[model samples]
Target chain A: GIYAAFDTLMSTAGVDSQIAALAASEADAGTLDAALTQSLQEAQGRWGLGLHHLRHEARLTDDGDIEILTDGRPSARVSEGFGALAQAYAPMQALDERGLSQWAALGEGYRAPGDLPLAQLKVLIEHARDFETDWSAGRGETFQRVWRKGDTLFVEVARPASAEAALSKAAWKVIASIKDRAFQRELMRRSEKDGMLGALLGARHAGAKANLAQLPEAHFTVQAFVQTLSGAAARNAEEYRAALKTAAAALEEYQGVTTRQLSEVLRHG
Target chain B: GIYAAFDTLMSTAGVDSQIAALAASEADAGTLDAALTQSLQEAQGRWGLGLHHLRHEARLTDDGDIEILTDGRPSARVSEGFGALAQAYAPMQALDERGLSQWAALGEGYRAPGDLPLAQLKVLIEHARDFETDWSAGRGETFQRVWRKGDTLFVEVARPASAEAALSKAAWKVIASIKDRAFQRELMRRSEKDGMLGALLGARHAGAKANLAQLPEAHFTVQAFVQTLSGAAARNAEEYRAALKTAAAALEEYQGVTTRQLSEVLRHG
Candidate 1:
């Protein structure tokens, strides 16, 4: 299969050189045009191959025809074998060139007015902009891995973000909305499966139990405080406030939880 | 500062409860409207805070007033306190809601016709489609990681892909173009910086010299064959053909290479 493809390419190159010479030597225009058209028709099948590789459904329209249809649309036609097919698919090529040019301009932080079909160009430009944003954002979390076995090499890209970040963000919003400390604790407890605070608590608890030596002193203090608060009878606002102040002060030295942060959570709750 | 924020939130919640009670108790329309307007005007400052948090450039206008400008555009004015500001920034809220609705629709694999400003809607739709494509592509490479330190839980995500994939794809295209064996090897050697094959060869050569255990047996065979072909004095087409046949046959049992792939390289070079 590879040899056949290579052979066709060599033949195509030969034809291209001939056409170049014919043009320089004042060859008959009709004959040259016919030869070019023949070349295009011969190349038509590659369009289907290219499209198929992109996961597009592409095929000839019917038996013994040079027309190619893709996903229910007439995309290309080859009237003169190879060259005429090239002419028929000129629009598709233009779409690609126009898109690339527009994107290049945008890369320089400028957008030139489109000379292509307005609606399609607009769509293409929009896609480029959004794709740029997503790529930029996702790049932060992406990493590359490469391994080999014999003559074969495996290369992969992996990108992932913590679901906890999202959970934490939402938890902050919920904390901001609440106003009673006791009620806040109750809500946090109820939201154990649905909030970052719960996940943080669970993780810390598991860690503290699994490896006390590896656990930080601050974590032990927090766990003890939480247990006391959950079990203690802090019925009044003043009692809740006093309990919160003590916990916040103890957590002040921690990197992830500052006194200000602990205070904010307690104040809201 | 955090306590102050919490106090403001508590005050806001108190105001909200009062308003709800007032509405339920058949409060006078004029007074209720006035109260509501007052509340809105007070809340207007937070819009700037929200925008600032999002890295948007938002501040009061130069003129001595409660009007807000974001990105050089008048986003809000609190002349009637809250009510007037709401009216002034109705367009902004509409923009947000409309944008959200369009995105939501797209998330469900549907696109509802936009009732927002026509030009803006079209651009928005275009972005949504492009974003969908990017997110879909990006999702394939995304994964998650979480760890813990003391009282803190750390979460991260990593995604990456091989630069070699792009190189390999282009190499294949170039392979489909050339037709001489010795010339192909020369081209491949020259394209070392420009193709995946060059990178693969470099990696394997370095690996073989560094650690025989890390080098695959098939790779050794391929390297030996490549060395023979490159050093051989095959001066004619028949000799080139025979060399390629011999090389391809040895590579057939390799993990990544086959007779077809070897022929592809020779056919083009």
Candidate 2:
């Protein structure tokens, strides 16, 4: 919740701040951080606007513990009864190497450093991790999204040439290599059965066609231009495969799901 | 000319690709890349936008390289090149280590790992170099347009957590050290130019106002919420300072513009 409030200030300052403020109230009831509480006191003292109105509020102590504060009649959770589940959301974070590699190859720009996959993946992961860390901190829960259809997933990023273009081919190669890896497939099966996919889709961008350039923050836009497929169905196989890697990686980072054990399965299969 | 054309592409593509193509053909002449020369082939074949009539156009290629056939005759140079005489742009990217420190001191949720400044700078350089190689290549000649300004010089990253974060901080510290140590008042000489602040502003943002959330292809838009500064003033300082570090390291990856002499300036100053 603090992450949400902080993220609000970082990215979408106006609306996010209110949302975070609301979440804080809901989670902590009336508790707010000392510095934050002091700031609020000053704002309320200064601004003519009703800066104090709230749906709910969080109470934070000088000791850093958060409790609930609400406008309506309060429950016991207001008095430090709240658990981790009350915290609800686990603030999103980045992935490790293999996961990052998977993201680079699959994302719109499948451009890697060298011909070698892992080297490219390394480059991608290095930059991607940096980007994720920075962007996440700056934007909070804002995430790079991926679309899934059958064995593929697709996502776009700013042009492959932009500062975030570090995802490498090896990462994609490894991801694609493990596409049907039983470990992940099993998780997908379980997830699908539990209707997690539906929930995720509900949160995903609804449009069938998506482009990274169209996004507000995009420095440049480039689609996955697949060249060299000699087949009957002018398929987006390269893009699809690359998209799979990107999508999987995005999902992995956002949702913390992966099929890494698939490769192990194949090695031992 | 290729550099100019490529820069045009980068700038145009920054706004719109369709316009970039139009500008490339109609306005930008003599200099262009091998890829642009083959535009007609792409249009007719890939895009199915038949322009068979315009296929073989006239243009001098570099040395005697067979210029790929574009439809129309494109245009020429703008008088200046990547040199200092040419229109220059710079951007600052900082890690906000001090801010992070304050947050940690206050027991903020996003506490970073404590690492010394030099070590962190190493990580920033390594990862930044990797991102620079891939992303800049994607931009090609346009990268020259993505130049750094010597006016504002480098800003400190000071992230205090990860290696990349450290690198971001060290980058600025290096520049400051270089400025303070090497040139001494010569650093002040640049700082004293009448329009230095304005020039620094222009340089720090490169050629455009950047929004991290909107940056295309970007992995993470790393920015910090400075604790004390108010609104736009804080934001500007943050952006300008951040760009100094990111751009400096990025430049180091290629030309090493922020040379050893530059480092001494920061070290002593």
Candidate 3:
């Protein structure tokens, strides 16, 4: 169902069949741009008008579930364009949430919504646990070959050549095409929010900065202890309460000195 | 966000305080019905025009995600009333997908979109797996106390003794409020699909039937074997392939009979 909608949008651009075939073959950036352009055109109509406000509002808006009380309808009827945006945006958001956008941008060349490589990677990532029959038992060499290719792509995307490199240039073409500043800002905000801002920035500028060497080891120690708490079983109230206190302490200790400052910096600065 | 809309609707109906207080005190079916009636009235105006056809079509419709093509909107611009319905229905459907409707219905007496019991049960069911530190260690006694109360309500609904019976009669009022046969049938279809047809039916007739005793043991044996396959590790390619083949055979062997018949029964009957 998700792919079908993607197929339809690409088909509208008259490149669905060609891209689907090329997806099985070699890299084709030209064709991929054509596909992306068509989808963007569709997005432009609905997002163009309120692009600025919508992007800013998204930060304050939590799209998470909340309880509803009474029956009410939209005050005004949405135009077909708005409805189309709302409907199609559903799957796109789902894919974005799963980090597919970052994964797709990893490839060296062109990628479309229904690309085979894209679809295959999604299936593998979503089902890695279930894909292998036995885990402790060695995975076969054939599956390993596939994994290696994907792993290579991931590594490459992680390390770009330079600010004027291919990834940066490509991502700029994408970011610059926003006829509406509002939409552009929203896209950037989303990229940042998803923690994939590094990959996105790798497309245009140098790789993102991480202060790992300057960071404390206490963070990892707390994290390791937290992992140990997983699936823990308590013998009694005392045991359960003790485990909770340990968890509380771990979070409190981390928040007290180091992480809380980082959080404040991100929130305000 | 979903619940926020619900609260707004109840506030509009002037029941925000009454429902909030009553939700904690006792079952007030009258107030619950009044609340529902208001929401339905809003649905009526939008649904009223196509009242006959819209209701019937709902049964044949499957509401799973579909990628919409083209810039098509609801042909007529919906007035604010219908717009309210559309906005409100978005979260309602999301909750439905999470099996919240049946869970909410499982509660005693009155149930609204934002009812405390409904929201509390959702958190419990959704997070039950990760709530405790360990499964074997046992969840703390306090959680168990809450679980027991919810569990008691579930059990009570399962058995309805008389007209004064809390579960049956309350649910009956809900079932019978169908001035719309088409809407009623669709609701029934949904109830059946969710594996809760028995409970819905229990409101009117005797409880649902169970043929588990007559079922073949092979079904469960196969299921248990499937579970064992989880997190399994293979020692070599040969072991991996062997496990794969067994899985393949297991599916192929069963599909040769059972699932095929089930498909036939559903399509033809």
lDDT of 3 at B63: 27
Candidate 2 chain B has its poorest 10 consecutive residues by lDDT at: B129-138
- Candidate 3, position A115, lDDT: 23
Please write out the lDDT profile of model 2 over residues B1-269, one tens digit for every residue. Answer: 44343333222112112324544466444443433444323322211111222443324444622233333433222222222111121111121322221211111111122332333333333322111111111122211101111121122222112312322233344534444454534443544542222122223322212321122111111121111222232224345445544543443332222123223332332
Of the true interface contacts, each candidate retains a share of: 0.15, 0.02, 0.00
| Runs in model 3 lying further than 4 Å from the true structure | A1-269, B1-269
Q: TM-scores of the first chain across all predictions?
A: 0.19, 0.20, 0.19
Error of 1 at A263 (Å): 82
RMSD of each: 44.1, 28.2, 27.7
lDDT of 1 at A236: 27
> TM per model?
0.17, 0.16, 0.16
Top lDDT prediction, candidate number = 1
lDDT of 1 by residue, B124-237 (tens): 332222112211111223322111111222122212212133234434555545577776676567456545344323444334223322211111111111112221222222
- Residues A1-269 of candidate 2 have per-residue lDDT tens digits of 45343322222111113435645466543433443344333322111111122333334545444433334333223223222212221122133321221233222322222222333332223222221111111022222322222222223321122101211121222434556677545534543433222122222222201222222112111211111211211123344345435533443342221123212222332
Error of 2 at A69 (Å): 10
